[PDB]
Design an enzyme around this catalytic site. Structure first.
Site, mmCIF file in Angstrom:
data_model
loop_
_atom_site.group_PDB
_atom_site.id
_atom_site.type_symbol
_atom_site.label_atom_id
_atom_site.label_comp_id
_atom_site.label_asym_id
_atom_site.label_seq_id
_atom_site.Cartn_x
_atom_site.Cartn_y
_atom_site.Cartn_z
ATOM 1 N N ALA A 148 5.431 -16.651 -5.936
ATOM 2 C CA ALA A 148 5.307 -17.409 -7.178
ATOM 3 C C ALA A 148 3.882 -17.923 -7.381
ATOM 4 C CB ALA A 148 6.300 -18.555 -7.193
ATOM 5 N N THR A 181 14.821 -12.309 -7.261
ATOM 6 C CA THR A 181 14.125 -12.177 -8.535
ATOM 7 C C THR A 181 14.437 -10.849 -9.221
ATOM 8 O OG1 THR A 181 12.295 -13.607 -7.820
ATOM 9 C CG2 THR A 181 11.889 -12.127 -9.684
#
Lengths: 234, 199, 233, 243, 220, 204, 238, 201, 250
Positions: free
Chosen positions: H49, H1
């Site tokens: 997430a 990420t």
């Protein structure tokens, strides 16, 4: 002579609930009209002094962008139910990612109906009914809806409804002028007319509040000018 | 890693802190402020764990302000220090202890200037000068070498500069800028930042 | 199933009176009389333990009860309430001893018991105790004599009487008694002030006596009380 | 614990305990407040001037925060409770939210509190009414008022306590944009309003003012005497040379 | 620590040493390890000192309450029950090892009580770091129905065995003799141990300690 | 160890009709010294002092809660507290935390406020009391202090000799301990007065 | 009048007035009828409107796929009980993976409703229920009162002016067990009809129907979905 | 990420990649790592997430309730403070969350970094994630408060891109949002493969 | 249950709490107690209702409670309630001391107790504490201070006041004789002796009937002392010898 808050009358009713219904009859009168073009809600502010800022009087609030509510009676009691309704809508959005149906919100607020009592309860439980009548006006998949709720917890859908002190007269006047094909303009017009009929003061731009909910537009509270444009067409 | 320093004079308290908020191997902030105003004459320099510092400091702050609003007068630096020490000590053996090291600078109309040192174990100690962090290990001695109880605030700032320069020389951590405030009879005054124009 | 009444049963009258407390005091001033005398080197407690039949075993229940090794109790009013207060007082004494490893001062015991008594004049669903207490004790060299009433108030006495005819017993004490009396003389005048009311032949089993010098509190044997009731010894 | 309905409905639909609370308020010292442009003033009547009493310990004008002040009328103890709770909430607002506090917010908190006490088992309504006064960020000056019922409204000027109707009427007749055009004129209007119910003095009037980002200012009886003096002068230089 | 107890013809002899150690350093040379429970019941304590102290005091208190209410002298079974149930409830986290002895209406009774809450009723018991030595003495020289002085001699011998053979034990010997009509709380029995006389005088004379600061505060 | 985290030493010594209590002045965190004026001896009434060594936080906290309960005691009862009673009070206070103890080993030194008979004692971290007729020690240099006290202490000493003795003991014991010292303070208390001195000591 | 205000107070004649007053709350509600064949169970209910500009009150609620109810009295208590029943049914499906037997659900309702008729400061449920269900023992119609009593009915009617319906049903009991669905709903509608003056009659606006059976989950019909049932009735003339 | 955000003269630029892995395996390349909390509040997703999404959704709910109650919209600072306080109560329990709350306020463009550890700091530029170090390199070399809008967009896009190049756990697509005074606008969503041909040749 | 409930925390139709007022009536029948402020100290003077020939006298006082090393109080009403409240006051003071490591300001202590009393008036269904209190003290904020609290949890600061039997008359007399900014401990003592001499039903006034305590500031420490009977008799004799002096002039 003092009895419990959960005592039945020989007629089969709860004294407190009935007395609350009585307590509504002192409230500012309010009018709701359901229409395929939208739902309108109008209420008198009842200003008791020129020194009182009338903009601090809201008897019509937004439950959510597609649901409004008009209240009559003990406003202080109404604030609680309004907040509970808003929280409910937001929880439903959080959990399901979709808006609440007006009937679902109304039912939710109605669940706090006879949730009062002395013994066998939490130390933070209600001691008495809410002395307030509510009018929910919204738009969903079933279109524009309007519901009415009283301290009994009984809620019902209504095409045109009046609550408050001048309830009966205003309701009759509404019956005489309502049909399931009016325009929103005719609805608002009618509402303001009957309101002026029942109000003791002279109807003006800073004396009532009016709000609409239409399928294409979120909850809207009418501004002073927007009110003037309507009162012009008396 | 974080650096605090306090130097008490005869009628003033000088305080300074690094301006780096760091995580991993990067500096994420270079204008971070470690100080907290708690009264018109009290500063709280808090340092340590990520969330504990701000939570604790602000809790204390709002409680001191609450005292002020409830009683009309402010807490003394001593009463304040013992208050934060009590709060920190009560949470020590609880489920939610606070990993914070702190300095409390203050000026009282009666007892004068004050500098308090607090360990994360909540041991309270009044001192003429103190420091927190790894940098302290390189600075305290300098203070020991050059501090006199009658030191002027000008000389105090000079001494502070000596310590910070030493940090620039020996410390492996960056630390290019430093917040500097001073407390006296007239309240908290912000001094120009001590910086070393690296890049 | 049960919970509890959470409101006060003891309330102020418009006159400003706590009626239930005064009615409790009325219950006290209807019970068998009791006398207490502090006498320089000791304290005497005595009471009318007059039964209602020869069937009653007077060697089973007592009115003069020990609280610890150095503190004693008697009462006027309702028995069961007194019994409750006795248990409670003993418990309090032992708590004190556990915390301080030092025998409880008489005044402290009196204060704690009095606090317990005050609770039952304000807490919910209860009536006050129908009992006045006389507490004797030896602590810090000096002797001690207290009285605690249903309101939860307490007073230190040199000598006093409670129960039936407590006023005349009190006057009798005020005249026919004063300081510098040895414990023996005090016992004498105590049985003497009890005799100012004890309708009938006052035997060694009609009254109960307890003493408190600096050797500890104890109940007098019926034999010793007989010797004293020989109007001599 | 004590779980009994204190506040209940009457057959005619009244909440008697709340009404009695409002009576208790009606027995309170008169308190008035007016809103100006850059100034807001609140003044309270009978301070129970025993003269053997420390005035400081019996003030009916408190500060909730640096931003918001408040007056009251009714049961002083209840007022103390509500005031301190309001203070706690004023600080907790700063904790939970970086921004300070709006007058309407704290007014809403106090109101909701009272309403809660009108609908909870074991509890008894607060027998007080409050005049909340403040300056919000953005600079708009505001005055609100609450009630033992939980209702609250904004006002331009208002009065509560003994003879609130009289002072309310006076304020209705005297509140103009000409009056309260200057700070010294608004304060003058407040003193003028208070002197219409008070026992006519100046040693029996407490007056506090707030303005801009500045702190609450309490007026010492010297300044109050001066204002009442200019008042009596204007009451003899515009009312004497006329009638 | 070495504590022991024995049952003789007329009652019970309890014995204890007087050394209290913190680690391998003697802190107390005259520790009292024989605790009052009731006028007729006594208890020697080994294990965690504070725990034996508080346990024994608590039980003493509850027993005083009990006898005060009953008007009778406490029984040893009662003490045993209270102790063992309290201790079991705490699952060994209260480090009280006890020798409980007393005289009842039913006669003399000696229990050993372990910190987990198990008890044993025995004519002779030992507890502590020096318990095996004392137990050796008992298993070698114990006979039923001994006389008082014989029993005292036996117990003191066992405690001595512990004292001289265990590093945890030392100093003096305390005995407690409990019979149907006598209580001999001998403390201490006999100190078989003495510090050697000081060969020197390490007395410091006034002024030998340098002083930086003085402040005299008058009292009343 | 937890006790050695801040270090420190506290000692008490009996005299004739007098008593003494001493403590070092160092407040440090492991190897690093923070302050040289740390208070470890607290007045708990006239002629009654308590000495606390160990974890600095619990020193301060135990001292404070002790003053709390003590003040309540002296209010409920109309008297200053007796030494035995103070000892039992501290013992109770410490045993309340039997399974999460304060890390301090207190030392009590005082004269009976009614008589004048000297009293000394020490307690566990969980409040096991120990009274002696000679001396008591607590701290990171306990063995050292024992060594000195066993060789210097005489029975019936006068105030001056009690002072010299406890001072030499404290100084020489502390000077063989890395985390104790930076000054020594001595309170010698007798019937009429209280003498408080700070000793000339090494600062390393 | 001193034995009137608390459910915990017996009258000197062996009655509890709060329970009876609570029973009176059932009669204040619009009438409802319930009957069963040997395969089907049917609730028919006369809705009711405040004013003409208001819709007609819901009278029939869905509980589980095999169980539905018709209410009479306090609507809040009705929704309370409804949620209770729904939860119990869900619990049963969750644990046993089989639908909850109707008689047991009813028994549970009895147990739950009995409780506050014995505790101080508590009140009886001010609502009467008609329960239509189908299980391994066939169709079922139950009746629950505020007295916490319950009945296994062959047919029943409760609410205002329900005595008439009760009489009609009492006449045509022997027909019901062999009727077909259309005829059963018909009979229910006639029973409901006899509870009205000659001036007013059934409509697709003031009638709700609920059916459950061996070949049909519990279903609610109203508005235009009622029309097929009504348009098949004899215009009973005065 | 790899996520970044920076504030400049014309508002707040927010950018993110779209790769999500489970170990070495790539579970998705179509992850919306810029969270639309509001029409006026943007969050980012780094760490877990689920934690980010759930807690920032709860944040959205709270913000809406705030807007209803106070008839005004929450500030960026109050929102970030709310989130930080919510997350702080689960400290040590294993929440993994590194987010950037971006908005426009009475104080103008607002940008706060909020940690699952407890951090909550205001600043000019931020970058969170396994690729943050690489994005910082180019973002810092290109950043100016006086950047033009197109310049800002190009900078953010390039930073995220280079980050995808060096960091194995970053890739997929570069998504780009712009926060203006009147709310945020979804600027772009370019694929890395396209950007490769655009940038290299 | 609803039947037996006396409803103690309930408004009356006129907007008042009956039990609080009745409690005030109870207070009115209690021993007279007054307090006067000065520039060099502050004092309490109270009527002793515990005056019988057979009382043992083992306490420093009867109606004078020490609360704190810088603060003391006197009481009027039901004594047991006073014991409760005084204990709680001590607790509060020690809590403040534990928290801030400095003595609690007097006003804060008074407010802290008054919130408890108020709480008793507002909820719980319990009777209120039939007790009024007078507080004397010193602090670094307002110096010498005198306070007064009622069972409603309502309090006020005074320069001089009275409480108990014949309180109003005492208040009027105080209003006559008081001396703002011109008060000394000696003068205030005289005033106390005077007012007590007039208000007390039993004339002549013996020291066996009065109890006086002063709070003063000496050498950085705060001193609280109860006057010995001798000093009291000196004061009374002074009062009579001044009263027989102003009566000569005619």
């Amino acid at each position: 002579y003092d009895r419990g808050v959960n005592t039945f009358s020989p007629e089969g009713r709860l004294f407190q609930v009935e007395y609350a219904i009585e307590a509504i009859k002192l409230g500012s009168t309010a009018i709701g009209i359901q229409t395929s073009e939208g739902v309108c809600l109008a209420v008198e502010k009842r200003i008791t002094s020129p020194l009182m800022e009338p903009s601090s009087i809201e008897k019509i609030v937004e439950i959510d962008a597609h649901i409004g509510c008009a209240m009559s009676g003990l406003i202080a009691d109404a604030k609680t139910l309004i907040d509970k309704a808003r929280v409910e809508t937001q929880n439903h959005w959080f959990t399901y990612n979709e808006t609440m149906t007006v009937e679902s919100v109304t039912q939710a607020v109605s669940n706090l109906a006879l949730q009062f009592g002395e013994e066998d309860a939490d130390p933070g439980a209600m001691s008495r009914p809410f002395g307030v009548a509510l009018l929910f006006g919204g738009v969903d998949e079933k279109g524009p809806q309007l519901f009415h709720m009283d301290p009994s917890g009984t809620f019902v859908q209504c095409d045109a409804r009046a609550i408050g002190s001048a309830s009966e007269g205003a309701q009759s006047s509404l019956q005489e002028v309502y049909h399931k094909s009016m325009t929103l303009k005719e609805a608002i017009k009618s509402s303001l007319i009957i309101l002026k009929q029942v109000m003791e003061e002279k109807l003006n731009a800073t004396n009532i509040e009016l709000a609409t909910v239409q399928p294409g537009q979120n909850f809207h509270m009418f501004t002073k000018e927007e009110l003037e444009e309507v009162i012009k067409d008396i | 890693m974080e650096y605090l320093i306090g130097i008490q004079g005869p009628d003033y308290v000088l305080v300074a802190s690094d301006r780096v908020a760091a995580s991993n191997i990067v500096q994420m902030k270079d204008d971070h402020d470690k100080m907290f105003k708690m009264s018109e004459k009290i500063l709280l320099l808090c340092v340590g764990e990520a969330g504990d510092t701000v939570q604790f400091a602000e809790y204390i702050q709002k409680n001191v302000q609450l005292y002020k609003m409830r009683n009309g007068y402010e807490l003394s630096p001593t009463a304040a220090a013992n208050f934060t020490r009590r709060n920190l000590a009560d949470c020590l053996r609880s489920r939610t202890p606070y990993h914070v090291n702190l300095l409390l600078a203050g000026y009282d109309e009666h007892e004068g200037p004050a500098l308090y040192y607090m360990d994360y174990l909540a041991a309270l100690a009044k001192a003429p000068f103190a420091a927190h962090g790894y940098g302290a290990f390189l600075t305290l001695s300098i203070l020991d070498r050059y501090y006199t109880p009658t030191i002027s605030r000008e000389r105090a700032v000079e001494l502070l500069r000596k310590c910070l320069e030493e940090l620039q020389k020996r410390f492996i951590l960056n630390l290019p800028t430093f917040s500097v405030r001073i407390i006296d009879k007239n309240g908290i005054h912000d001094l120009d930042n001590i910086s070393f124009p690296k890049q | 199933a049960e919970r509890g009444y959470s409101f006060s049963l003891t309330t102020f009258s418009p006159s400003g009176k706590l009626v239930q407390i005064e009615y409790a005091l009325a219950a006290v001033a209807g019970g068998a009389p009791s006398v207490g005398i502090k006498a320089a080197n000791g304290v005497v407690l005595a009471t009318e333990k007059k039964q209602k039949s020869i069937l009653y075993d007077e060697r089973s229940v007592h009115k003069v009860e020990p609280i610890t090794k150095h503190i004693g109790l008697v009462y006027s009013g309702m028995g069961p309430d007194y019994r409750v207060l006795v248990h409670r007082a003993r418990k309090l004494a032992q708590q004190y001893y556990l915390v301080y490893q030092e025998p409880i001062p008489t005044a402290q015991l009196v204060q704690r018991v009095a606090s317990v008594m005050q609770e039952y004049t304000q807490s919910g669903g209860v009536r006050p105790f129908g009992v006045s207490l006389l507490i004797c004790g030896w602590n810090e060299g000096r002797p001690y004599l207290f009285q605690s009433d249903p309101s939860g108030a307490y007073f230190a006495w040199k000598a006093t009487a409670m129960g039936k005819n407590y006023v005349n017993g009190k006057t009798f004490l005020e005249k026919r008694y004063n300081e510098d009396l040895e414990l023996e003389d005090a016992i004498h005048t105590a049985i003497l002030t009890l005799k100012e009311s004890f309708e009938g032949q006052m035997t060694e089993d009609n009254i109960e006596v307890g003493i408190c010098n600096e050797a500890g509190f104890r109940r007098l044997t019926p034999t010793e009380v007989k010797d004293y009731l020989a109007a001599i010894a | 614990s004590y779980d009994r309905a204190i506040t209940v409905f009457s057959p005619d639909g009244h909440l008697f305990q709340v009404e009695y609370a409002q009576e208790a308020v009606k027995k309170g010292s008169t308190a008035v407040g007016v809103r100006g442009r850059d100034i807001v003033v609140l003044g309270v009547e009978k301070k129970s001037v025993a003269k053997l009493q420390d005035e400081r310990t019996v003030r009916k004008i408190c500060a909730l925060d640096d931003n918001v002040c408040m007056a009251f009328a009714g049961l002083t103890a209840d007022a103390r409770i509500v005031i301190n709770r309001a203070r706690v909430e004023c600080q907790s607002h700063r904790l939970t939210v970086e921004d300070p506090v709006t007058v309407e917010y704290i007014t809403r908190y106090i109101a909701s509190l009272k309403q809660r006490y009108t609908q909870s088992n074991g509890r008894r309504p607060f027998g007080i009414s409050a005049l909340i006064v403040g300056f919000d960020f953005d600079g708009t000056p505001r005055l609100y008022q609450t009630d033992p019922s939980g209702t609250y409204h904004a006002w331009k000027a208002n009065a509560i306590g003994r003879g609130a109707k009289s002072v309310r009427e006076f304020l209705e007749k005297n509140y103009t944009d000409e009056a309260i055009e200057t700070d010294d004129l608004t304060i003058k209007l407040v003193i003028k309003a208070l002197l219409e119910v008070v026992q006519s003095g100046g040693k029996n009037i407490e007056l506090a003012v707030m303005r801009r980002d500045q702190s609450l200012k309490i007026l010492n009886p010297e300044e109050i005497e001066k204002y009442v003096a200019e008042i009596e002068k204007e009451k003899e230089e515009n009312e004497k040379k006329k009638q | 620590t070495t504590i022991a107890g024995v049952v003789y013809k007329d009652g019970i002899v309890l014995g204890a040493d007087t050394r209290a150690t913190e680690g391998m350093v003697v802190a107390d040379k005259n520790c009292s390890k024989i605790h009052f429970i009731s006028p007729n019941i006594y208890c020697c304590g080994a294990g965690t000192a504070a725990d034996t102290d508080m346990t024994t005091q608590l039980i003493s208190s509850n027993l005083e309450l009990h006898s005060l209410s009953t008007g009778r002298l406490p029984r040893v079974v009662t003490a045993n029950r209270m102790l063992k149930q309290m201790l079991f409830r705490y699952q060994g986290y209260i480090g009280a090892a006890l020798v409980l002895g007393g005289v009842d209406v039913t006669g003399p009774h000696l229990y050993s009580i372990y910190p987990h809450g198990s008890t044993d009723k025995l004519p002779y018991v030992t507890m502590g770091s020096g318990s095996l030595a004392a137990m050796a003495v008992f298993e070698d020289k114990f006979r039923p129905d001994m006389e008082e002085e014989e029993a005292k001699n036996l117990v003191s011998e066992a405690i001595a065995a512990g004292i001289f053979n265990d590093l945890g034990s030392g100093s003096n010997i305390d005995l407690c003799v409990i019979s149907k009509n006598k209580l001999d709380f001998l403390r201490p029995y006999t100190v078989p141990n003495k510090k050697g006389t000081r060969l020197g005088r390490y007395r410091c004379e006034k002024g030998t300690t340098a002083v930086l600061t003085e402040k005299i505060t008058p009292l009343e | 160890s937890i006790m050695s985290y801040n270090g420190g030493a506290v000692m008490a010594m009996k005299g004739k009709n007098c008593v003494a209590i001493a403590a070092d002045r160092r407040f440090g965190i492991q190897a690093q010294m923070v302050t040289t004026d740390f208070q470890k001896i607290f007045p708990m009434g006239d002629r009654l002092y308590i000495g606390l060594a160990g974890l600095a936080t619990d020193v301060q906290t135990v001292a404070q809660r002790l003053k709390f309960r003590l003040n309540l005691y002296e209010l409920k009862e109309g008297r200053q507290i007796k030494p035995y009673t103070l000892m039992s009070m501290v013992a109770n206070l410490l045993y309340e935390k039997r399974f999460g103890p304060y890390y301090t080993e207190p030392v009590i030194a005082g004269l009976d406020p009614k008589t004048f008979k000297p009293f000394i004692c020490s307690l566990d971290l969980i409040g096991c009391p120990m009274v002696t007729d000679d001396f008591v020690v607590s701290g990171t240099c306990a063995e050292q202090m024992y060594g000195m006290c066993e060789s210097l202490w005489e029975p019936n000493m006068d105030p001056d000799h009690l002072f010299e003795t406890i001072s030499q003991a404290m100084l020489n014991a502390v000077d063989r301990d890395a985390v104790s010292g930076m000054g020594v303070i001595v309170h010698i208390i007798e019937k009429d007065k209280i003498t408080t001195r700070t000793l000339k000591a090494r600062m390393d | 009048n001193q034995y009137d205000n608390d459910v915990t107070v017996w009258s000197p004649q062996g009655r509890i007035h709060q329970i009876e007053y609570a029973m009176e709350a059932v009669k204040q509600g619009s009438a409802t009828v319930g009957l069963k064949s040997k395969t089907h169970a049917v609730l028919v209910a006369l809705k009711r409107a405040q004013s003409e500009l208001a819709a007609h009150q819901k009278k029939i609620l869905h509980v589980d796929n095999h169980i539905g109810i018709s209410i009479a009295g306090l609507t809040a208590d009705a929704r309370l009980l409804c949620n209770f029943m729904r939860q119990e049914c869900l619990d049963s499906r969750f644990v046993f993976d089989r639908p909850l037997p109707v008689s047991r659900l009813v028994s549970l309702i009895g147990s739950k409703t009995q409780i506050p008729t014995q505790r101080y400061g508590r009140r009886p449920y001010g609502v009467g229920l008609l329960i239509a269900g189908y299980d391994d023992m066939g169709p079922h119609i139950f009746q629950t009162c505020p007295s916490a009593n319950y009945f296994d009915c062959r047919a029943m009617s409760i609410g205002a002016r329900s005595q008439s319906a009760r009489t009609y049903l009492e006449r045509h009991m022997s027909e019901f067990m062999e009727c077909n669905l259309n005829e059963l709903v018909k009979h229910g509608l006639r029973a409901l009809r006899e509870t009205l003056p000659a001036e007013q009659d059934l409509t697709t606006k003031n009638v709700s129907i609920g059916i459950v059976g061996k070949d049909l989950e519990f279903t609610i019909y109203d508005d235009d979905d009622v029309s097929p049932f009504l348009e098949g009735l004899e215009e009973r003339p005065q | 990420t790899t996520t970044l955000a920076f504030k400049f003269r014309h508002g707040v630029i927010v950018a993110a990649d779209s790769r999500a892995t489970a170990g070495a395996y790539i579970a998705s390349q179509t992850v919306k790592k810029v969270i639309e909390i509001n029409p006026y509040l943007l969050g980012t997703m780094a760490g877990g997430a689920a934690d980010c999404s759930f807690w920032e959704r709860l944040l959205a709910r709270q913000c809406r309730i705030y807007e209803l109650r106070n008839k005004e919209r929450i500030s960026v600072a109050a929102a970030s403070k709310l989130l930080a306080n919510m997350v702080y109560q689960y400290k040590g329990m294993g929440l993994s969350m590194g987010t950037m709350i971006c908005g426009w306020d009475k104080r103008g463009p607002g940008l706060y970094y909020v940690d699952s550890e407890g951090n909550r700091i205001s600043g000019a530029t931020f970058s969170v994630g396994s690729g943050s170090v690489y994005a910082y390199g180019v973002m810092d070399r290109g950043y100016s408060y006086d950047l033009e809008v197109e310049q800002a967009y190009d900078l953010a896009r390039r930073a995220i891109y280079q980050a995808t190049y060096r960091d194995a756990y970053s890739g997929g697509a570069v998504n780009l949002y712009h926060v203006r005074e009147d709310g945020w606008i979804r600027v772009s969503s370019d694929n890395v493969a396209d950007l490769h041909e655009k940038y290299s040749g | 249950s609803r039947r037996y409930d006396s409803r103690t925390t309930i408004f009356s139709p006129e907007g008042r709490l009956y039990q609080v007022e009745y409690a005030m009536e109870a207070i009115g029948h209690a021993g007279t107690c007054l307090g006067i402020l000065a520039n060099d100290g502050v004092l309490l003077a109270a009527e002793r209702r515990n005056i019988h020939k057979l009382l043992d006298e083992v306490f420093f006082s009867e109606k004078i409670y020490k609360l704190n090393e810088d603060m003391a109080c006197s009481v009027a009403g039901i004594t047991s309630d006073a014991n409760v409240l005084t204990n709680e006051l001590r607790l509060i003071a020690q809590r403040y001391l534990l928290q801030y490591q400095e003595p609690i300001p007097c006003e804060q202590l008074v407010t802290a107790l008054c919130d408890i009393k108020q709480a008793y008036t507002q909820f719980g269904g319990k009777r209120p504490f039939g007790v009024s209190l007078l507080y004397i003290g010193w602090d670094k904020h307002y110096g010498f201070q005198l306070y007064q609290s009622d069972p409603s949890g309502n309090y006020g600061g005074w320069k001089a006041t009275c409480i108990g039997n014949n309180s109003a008359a005492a208040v009027s007399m105080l209003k006559q004789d008081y001396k703002e900014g011109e008060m000394t401990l000696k003068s205030a003592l005289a005033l106390a002796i005077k007012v007590l001499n007039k208000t007390m039903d039993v004339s002549k006034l013996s020291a066996e009937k009065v109890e006086i305590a002063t709070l003063t500031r000496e050498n950085g420490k705060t001193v609280i002392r109860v006057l010995k009977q001798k000093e009291v008799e000196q004061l009374i004799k002074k009062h009579e010898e001044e009263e027989a002096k102003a009566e000569r002039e005619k």
